[PDB]
Amino acid sequence: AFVVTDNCIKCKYTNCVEVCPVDCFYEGPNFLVIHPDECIDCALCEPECPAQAIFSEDEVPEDMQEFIQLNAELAEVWPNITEKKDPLPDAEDWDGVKGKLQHLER
Ligand code: SF4
Ligand code: F3S
Structure with missing residues (x-):
């Protein structure tokens, strides 16, 4: 499985979803997640993230x-x-800020 981590929060560019062959991304207010059962580990989304927030789980x-x-x-x-979708309005001011997990919205 590939994993979305901290820097996606409050950026949510959504570039990653056009490349996914199996559509295993799910959407929250200010963050996206990869469903681990569905991901086929094709690694296609990882170069697409402007925020470089996606990693192989290993x-x-x-x-x-x-x-x-x-x-x-x-x-x-x-x-x-x-x-x-378009990025959050704010995306480029939050891109690179650490500890954005305290800002996550369910
Ligand atoms: S690694 Fe491939 S299958 Fe998994 S989330 Fe990324 S694009 Fe989708
Ligand atoms: S910022 Fe988030 S929504 Fe996708 S393009 Fe990067 S994992």
């Missing part, structure tokens, strides 16, 4: 391990997103 940073689990449980509760 590559997730030591300080971001919580995201592996988070992606798995939020994917169960959020709706499927299959079309790109």
Whole structure:
């Protein structure tokens, strides 16, 4: 499985969803998650993220391990997103800011 981590929060560019061959991204207010059962590990989304927030689960940073689990449980509760959208208005001011998990919205 590929995993969306901290820097997607409050950016949510959604570039990643056009490349997914199996449409396994799910959408929250200010973040996206990958459903781990569905991902086929094609790695196509990882170069597409402006925020470089996607990682192979074996590559997730030591300080971001919580995201592996988070992606798995939020994917169960959020709706499927299959079309790109515009970025959050604010996206480019929040891109690169650390610790954005305290800003996550369910
Ligand atoms: S690795 Fe491939 S299948 Fe998995 S979320 Fe990315 S684009 Fe979709
Ligand atoms: S910022 Fe988030 S919505 Fe996709 S393009 Fe990057 S994982």
